[PDB]
Design a protein around this ligand. Sequence first.
Ligand code: MGD
Ligand code: MGD
Ligand code: SF4
Ligand code: SF4
Ligand code: SF4
Ligand code: SF4
Ligand code: SF4
Ligand code: SF4
Ligand code: SF4
Ligand code: SF4
Ligand code: SF4
Ligand code: SF4
Ligand code: SF4
Ligand code: MO
Lengths: 65, 321, 131, 438, 79
Amino acid sequence: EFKVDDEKCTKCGICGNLCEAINVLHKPFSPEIGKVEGEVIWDEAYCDGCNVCAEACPSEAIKVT
Amino acid sequence: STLFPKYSKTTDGSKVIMEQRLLQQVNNLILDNDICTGCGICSEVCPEEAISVGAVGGVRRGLVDDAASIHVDETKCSYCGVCVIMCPFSALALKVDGEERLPILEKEGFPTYDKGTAIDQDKCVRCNICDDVCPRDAIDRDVPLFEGEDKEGLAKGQAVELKIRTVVGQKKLGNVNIIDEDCCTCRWCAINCPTEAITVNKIFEGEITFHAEKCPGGCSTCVDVCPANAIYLPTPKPAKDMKGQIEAKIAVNKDFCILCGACVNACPGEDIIYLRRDSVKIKGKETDLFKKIKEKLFTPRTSKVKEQPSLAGSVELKAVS
Amino acid sequence: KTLNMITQRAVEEGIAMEIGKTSRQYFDACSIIEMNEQDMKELGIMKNTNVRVKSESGEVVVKAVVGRQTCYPGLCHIRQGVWANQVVPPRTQSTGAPQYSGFPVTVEPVPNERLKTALELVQGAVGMWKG
Amino acid sequence: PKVIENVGCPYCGCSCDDVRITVSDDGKDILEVENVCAIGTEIFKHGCSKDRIRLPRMRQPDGSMKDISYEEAIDWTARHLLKAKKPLMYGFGSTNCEGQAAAARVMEIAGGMLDNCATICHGPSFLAIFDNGYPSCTLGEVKNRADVIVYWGSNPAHAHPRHMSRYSIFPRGFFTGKGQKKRTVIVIDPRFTDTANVADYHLQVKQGHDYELFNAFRMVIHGHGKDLPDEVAGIKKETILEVAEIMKNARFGTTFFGMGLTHTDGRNHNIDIAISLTRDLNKISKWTIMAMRGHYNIAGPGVVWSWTFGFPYCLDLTKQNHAHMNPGETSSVDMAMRDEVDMFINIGTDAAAHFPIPAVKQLKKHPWVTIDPSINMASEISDLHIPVCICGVDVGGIVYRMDNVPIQFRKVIEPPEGVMDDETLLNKIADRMEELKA
Amino acid sequence: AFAVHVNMERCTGCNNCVVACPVNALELNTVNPSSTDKIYKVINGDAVILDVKHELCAGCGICVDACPYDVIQLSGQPP
Ligand SMILES: Nc1nc2c(c(=O)[nH]1)N[C@H]1C(S)=C(S)[C@@H](COP(=O)(O)OP(=O)(O)OC[C@H]3O[C@@H](n4cnc5c(=O)[nH]c(N)nc54)[C@H](O)[C@@H]3O)O[C@H]1N2
Ligand SMILES: Nc1nc2c(c(=O)[nH]1)N[C@H]1C(S)=C(S)[C@@H](COP(=O)(O)OP(=O)(O)OC[C@H]3O[C@@H](n4cnc5c(=O)[nH]c(N)nc54)[C@H](O)[C@@H]3O)O[C@H]1N2
Ligand code: SF4
Ligand code: SF4
Ligand code: SF4
Ligand code: SF4
Ligand code: SF4
Ligand code: SF4
Ligand code: SF4
Ligand code: SF4
Ligand code: SF4
Ligand code: SF4
Ligand code: SF4
Ligand SMILES: [Mo]
């Protein structure tokens, strides 16, 4: 079902702030990289076919089914 | 003698309050020791040479109790308020009677820093990155809190303007700003904003260099005290990847360094760090005093071991030619 | 009340033994209970007062203090030595290592009773206490 | 004012050899001692004393204690060792490795039980080593490579004071040039010890539940760590996962253990579950268990009797041509409990103080001999007290560090005129026993 | 140029204040060492501060944070 495109994701919380399934962990910010980088974790136990977060993402980084 | 010029220096909790009593007129230079960062841009700028810098690393780490980052001789201070205008992270305030009052600005006798902050609300998307990466607590994002971490601000389905189908255009629920008296112009939020909607310009310009080969290892005081977290300990490589290059001991990110000076004031080394500012960015016209202050801020500096004993209790740096 | 107990080290204790096992330094360093403040309040033990530590394999009168090394509620501690080994149970579990840490014990506030010196403890356990 | 470098501190497992002594002009008074901890400072200050034991001392009928000559004491001990039926020689924690070889020879001649402080200290650990193995390392290895350090059930700040500043945490090695700041230190014990103060984590575990803690860690490592209960041994599952992730990502780890594991429920099974954990971690990282040995040369009896009889401790030398070892049956405390001895010889330890008092009561039924440099509890309830030189102060030799690395200790003071050392003493006892033709 | 005070009564000689001081670590652990003077050295079992005239300390707090049983008080105010 769910699939993110880490190629086009900026790790903006506006995708994990909506659903209770999407929890976005920003691993600690270090000037090493100087960038934001984390992971998007989706759990089945909370989803729906709502698909709101597909278009809530600023980018098109989320396709769900 | 005479008593009524009562000079007092009280440490009321976390605020060091420096005062000058009269019958009805007071003068309160109040330093908020939770926000000071140990830079000396308050000691370099003091027209009357009263503010000195103390145990920056210890105080900024919490291991010192009987002192603040800075000591102000309130008998010498003149309550001009130049330190309050020229402190990049506003951790110094002047209260004349009982109110934060700056006569020199009221008369326009001194320029102020142009941090120039702004967030084009027609481009910001209520993301959470700018509040997350901000080294200081200076992003005031006013957004209703949806099902993420709380009860719905409106509803998961009302976070997107949906007609219940297709989305109608754009959502942008709420409003995000930058507390302009707290931003230090690090640019972590502009460099990492997803939609390039943040406009901040560094107050200082110049260059800082790190001679990694002179850091004595386990001294991450510079890392601990950097306000804009520009400094890092370069992560040791794994095996089968070292490739004969061992590692650096310390380095900096010039994209985020704001040329404050806390690193130089804190390093116990000899000349690991080289700091030199070239141009401060201001609004307000100028003054002969401001030209003197520019000349004072723009002299290159570096650490020093074994400074003179007669000034024990404070910091003295090296003048670089 | 059941008040589980352990027996461990301390630098002052090591210092004391190398001053000498029969020295006032050793007495002061080892004759010590280091228990929790909550347990001291609940039992009724005045800080810095003798107390009767009585396990199933002995008994000893030991000063009762509070230790920096924060014992969680329900733990005791004697710095190892004469006094602790007056009360350590000898069970080895067929390994030769007596139950030096983790034996139950009951604690009874008994001030106005002296502490027994190291020589007095050992030479009286054996039956040699001339003095 | 004759500064002497590279001396050895003869107290804790660290066997520190970076000690500088400023001996007096006449070579018999120690003035200032540099670079050593306090426990050590006091050892040297006691060794350089002016009023110290010089001759043996016997128990007369009246109960007092009067001196005798060395030859008379050797005769007494030899005759008693031969007349006995199963004498027990205990100690050897604080002696040179020649002192632990001479003793092996003496009790080979006699036929008794030979044993050391391993039984009551880290012998439960050896019993686990026998079960699972000992993936270990020298201390310079953790000085120069360690990225994670675990102090499981140990307290270096009070047990081994300069352990942290010499081998584990603070030194800036070769691949650890950044020093402490890239070392993750985890300390596990129910107390909030000074090691936990210095540490960066702390897993305050219920005393006695370390087996459940190790099993939790190892299920996490083996991969299906989701099957853990909500909390284990008082430790919370998320903290367990945190520490386990750090351990997995460690470039080169190292685990130290002590009385928290060797003196609680399941004496040796705690240690062998720890060793199993180390062997499991070496699947994805490099991890090395290591035991916090106590006395300087307490690993000396282990190696010396390993090369001599093949058994580190609990030696059954009564068959006179084949030895046996079973800690539950041949150990000093169990034999003292079951009154299975006939004579106790105190050599390099303080049995009276540091044994359980029921065992001391059971032992004192028989004759009791003490070979110590100074007065202690055993020398106060013994029958005769033979003086002997102090290792590292009056006499030099080899000692064995925590990690079985031989340090060479030096001599700084000549021992008082008349006092001999244990290797000369044990050799004279063996010669006299052979003279008595047994 | 601050002032450090060591409570000799509870100092154990652990030497983790000597090893951890970044001014002590300048001699052997730096490329082309600048200054080779040392704040602490453990003489007779307790840490002695050779920095009598308070010229080399930098108020880092690495030594206060290092001592296992807090015994080093750092003074951030002029002596
Ligand atoms: N000053 C001094 N130094 C010494 C000694 C001395 O007597 N005095 N003895 C020396 C010798 S003989 C020894 S063997 C070494 C050994 O000394 P160590 O092996 O380092 O052990 P301890 O100092 O006794 O402290 C053991 C720690 O384990 C904790 N503990 C107790 N029970 C448990 C438990 O169930 N689980 C866990 N995880 N922890 C527990 C204890 O609270 C304690 O914090 O020290 C040596 N150094
Ligand atoms: N309550 C409690 N009791 C315990 C423990 C516990 O955890 N809790 N742990 C037990 C364990 S771990 C052991 S190690 C014991 C440790 O306790 P011990 O092994 O008895 O250690 P010490 O008492 O310090 O013994 C030092 C004596 O040897 C003398 N000596 C020094 N050098 C020499 C030498 O070269 N030759 C000879 N012949 N003598 C020398 C010293 O002067 C001194 O008399 O404590 C044990 N008792
Ligand atoms: S899915 Fe969209 S909103 Fe969520 S983290 Fe990725 S880019 Fe940001
Ligand atoms: S599809 Fe709907 S329910 Fe599922 S994760 Fe996205 S927003 Fe949440
Ligand atoms: S200029 Fe720097 S040191 Fe001075 S008050 Fe502001 S933040 Fe603190
Ligand atoms: S108010 Fe003026 S004189 Fe007083 S400390 Fe600040 S800059 Fe110096
Ligand atoms: S990072 Fe940019 S887009 Fe995101 S909330 Fe801040 S200003 Fe808006
Ligand atoms: S420039 Fe730095 S301090 Fe200012 S708002 Fe952005 S991240 Fe925060
Ligand atoms: S790196 Fe830049 S911001 Fe950080 S302490 Fe140094 S000069 Fe200040
Ligand atoms: S630059 Fe200064 S603070 Fe940073 S490691 Fe080197 S000496 Fe320590
Ligand atoms: S740690 Fe042990 S060996 Fe090292 S100096 Fe201290 S007492 Fe001596
Ligand atoms: S504060 Fe820093 S420089 Fe000063 S003595 Fe301590 S570790 Fe050394
Ligand atoms: S670290 Fe603390 S205990 Fe150790 S020598 Fe220094 S002051 Fe003494
Ligand atoms: Mo031991």
